[PDB]
Write an enzyme that holds these catalytic residues in place. Structure first.
Site: not given
Lengths: 406, 406
Positions: B298, B392
């Site tokens: 990521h 998130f």
């Protein structure tokens, strides 16, 4: 191959702040539509809305609420209700990888997108924007803001599909359980009510404008003089759970989800083709051996939409038209929250044995002729109910729920 | 019980407008980050971005493009490429109930939300807003705008989960096929690039601000002096198809999706816990009998994030650390489009036999010590690759792809 049942529900809508108030409204055909000074002042032609009559101030912990927009608040309040109604204790659903959450909204937060842009253009710039606009404005706000406080460890994402949003969230929750990935999935959604988003629909001519002086009569599905939907807001959440798991803990089962259809029109961007709805309803009835006793239609109170749906219903049922009523005539159209709220209205009808009226029909549309559209509360033992959700972009969803043999 | 393979791909990104340009960039460690006059003029501190270098003017039919925002345009261009690459003709995928579309964006369209709000407050009101802002601004714009023109009849909805958005879209596409509901599902996403959305991340301190004068060095995953991610935009789309169906038509198979993990942290709203990532990677490796040869991390180039992920990787692999590189150092962070784009970068590596470099590391972080972080293009036969997407709200997604025995 797992069987899926609904064991708890929560709701905050234009007609009630909990399932008890909603039930009373449904039985009475009580309208939740009011005049909006906010919409009028913005310069819109539509001045009516289905607002949530609740002050959410102080209802959520300061540290949790700082990250949320209204859609999340509404969904958060509905989840709390659902957890209590399901009989779940923290140790059962928190920090548990077999428990997930799938919830979304149709528009995210136009209010906080705009607030952030306005703040940035002011003399304070970034300082005026603040560090919380991201979670408020991002499209997955509803799931992100709920999964964190409730300590969810399983799936966590939002599904978005305009008017069908929360119906797909419930359907996808069903699939996670059938796949054996989760034991429980909190599914639902929420939607904020604001001029920032409403003006967009008014600009497109989708909203009602001829009944601003008599708000309670603006939403009138199937009436010959309907002129568009009445925008609304709120939230809803249901506890989708695997059957054995539910039985093992002595849960109260409202119904079993026996069918779920999800199709696409691949035709018009804003109007339904009717063909996609036919396929959607048939897909959901696949393998359902009992007749449909009641159908909670999508029926948004628009000239073209109400009719295409009625045409699709005839195609599917022919002469076995089930009883039909559009609760949007009472509640307005809550967009992303409509799917789960309407599934909740249907579960309450199934549970309490009555069909809520399709109100405000002064002169029935001709194309509705021959269908069993219920216009007054009628007590009736229901066994299998269906709820339709057709959204912009030609996305369809249909859920079929049936009483589980006692 | 169906096996799922990827038979086509399309991409529009900061490092290339098609798979051929992207491949060259990946082999050269070519940066797609440039200085943005738009960001600077808005008053932001971050003035660098991963922009799509393509004029999309006239590339899409007038009547189709009037409903779209940039995310949809980027996703639309990617789908066209994917259809051509998959070898699909209209009669095979149009008006076919077994063919669906699952694609989303992380933020929808902050640009058109604001445009609509600004227009409404001006002297022209609703006339200035127009009838197209709804499809541009709604959270499901990416799927609605693509499903309609391409005549999709199967599933049609958007999944949203911040940085993990398009990885979940692909994983959910996989489940639809495993469930036997669809034969082909176009999966992916897109994201617009604008100050309206970027300022929100800057206000939160998430973006890089110390390298505005040397844009090509701002994104530097694992380097000791990284200071935040570099925002980017674009789109990507992959053709997810059932195995027999693909073989029957003589499709070119890039790889088989052998693993998909989707978990939640249930901890912090903006920072990863690392624990959810450990569970996510383990779930995706479940039943994968071959070692992971390469891991496209990521790695967004943030102080805390890069490290938590490195810690999770050690936990899962221990001493079998696979080769690792963060392509975000070259491309920037495209948010909702990151998942599918990074799955495409990994498929190209698997197909062409090379590991793209993790560029800009001048001083390796201490916590990266002992891991095989590749810093220069290296040719190598790869068999099983993994790609992480942590967003998130603590939502995680991991995809595992493997070469299908010739």
């Amino acid at each position: 191959m797992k069987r899926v049942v609904i064991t708890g529900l929560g709701i905050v809508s234009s007609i009630g702040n909990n399932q008890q108030e909603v039930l009373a409204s449904l039985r009475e055909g009580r309208s939740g539509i009011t005049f909006s000074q906010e919409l009028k002042d913005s310069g819109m032609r539509s001045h009516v809305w289905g607002n949530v009559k609740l002050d959410t101030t102080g209802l959520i912990d300061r540290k949790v609420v700082r990250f949320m927009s209204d859609a999340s608040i509404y969904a958060f309040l509905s989840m709390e209700q659902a957890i209590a109604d399901a009989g779940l204790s923290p140790e059962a659903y928190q920090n548990n990888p077999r428990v997930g959450l799938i919830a979304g909204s149709g528009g995210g937060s136009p209010r906080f997108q705009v607030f952030g842009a306005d703040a940035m253009r002011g003399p304070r710039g970034l300082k005026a924007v603040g560090p919380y606009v991201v979670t408020k404005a991002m499209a997955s706000g509803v799931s992100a803001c709920l999964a964190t406080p409730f300590k969810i460890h399983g799936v966590n994402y939002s599904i978005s599909s305009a008017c069908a949003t929360s119906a797909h969230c419930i359907g996808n929750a069903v699939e996670q359980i059938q796949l054996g990935k989760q034991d429980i999935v909190f599914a639902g959604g929420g939607e904020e009510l604001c001029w920032e988003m409403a003006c967009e629909f008014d600009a497109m001519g989708a909203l009602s404008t001829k009944y601003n002086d008599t708000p309670e009569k603006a939403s009138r599905t199937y009436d010959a003089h309907r002129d568009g939907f009445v925008i609304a807001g709120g939230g809803g959440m249901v506890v989708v759970e695997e059957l054995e798991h539910a039985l093992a803990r002595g849960a109260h089962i409202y119904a079993e989800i026996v069918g779920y259809g999800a199709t696409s029109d691949g035709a018009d961007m804003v109007a339904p083709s009717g063909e996609g709805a036919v396929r959607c309803m048939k897909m959901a009835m696949h393998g359902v051996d009992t007749p449909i006793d009641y159908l909670n239609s999508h029926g948004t109170s628009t000239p073209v939409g109400d009719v295409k749906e009625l045409a699709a219903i005839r195609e599917v049922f022919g002469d076995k038209s089930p009883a039909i009523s559009a609760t949007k005539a009472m509640t307005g159209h809550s967009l992303g929250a409509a799917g789960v709220q309407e599934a909740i209205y249907s579960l309450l009808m199934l549970e309490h044995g009555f069909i809520a009226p399709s109100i405000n029909i002064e002169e029935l549309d001709e194309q509705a002729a021959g269908l069993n559209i219920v216009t007054e509360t009628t007590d009736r033992e229901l066994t299998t109910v269906m709820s339709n959700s057709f959204g912009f972009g030609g996305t369809n969803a249909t859920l079929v729920m049936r009483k589980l043999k006692d």
